[PDB]
Amino acid sequence: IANQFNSAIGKIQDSLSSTASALGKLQDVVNQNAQALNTLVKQLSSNF
């Protein structure tokens, strides 16, 4: 049971080290606030 837990925590290092997409739920929240501020800045360049 200890060896399996230690091995499964090993797969957590390897997965997070390998893939880009695993933290998508957090990166998407940063991308939405960044895109909303970029839009609010770009919108200043309008004539209306």
Added chain:
Amino acid sequence: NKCVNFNFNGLTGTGVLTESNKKFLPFQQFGRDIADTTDAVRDPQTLE
């Protein structure tokens, strides 16, 4: 390097004026931000 009211060729505004490494082509006299505000200018007497 001080805050000033500037006027370059009739472009009135307020800000710090600073040396820059931007290489304006001969036909360009203002540079602008993504907000379409002027953020660089070539001085009309000494062409920096």
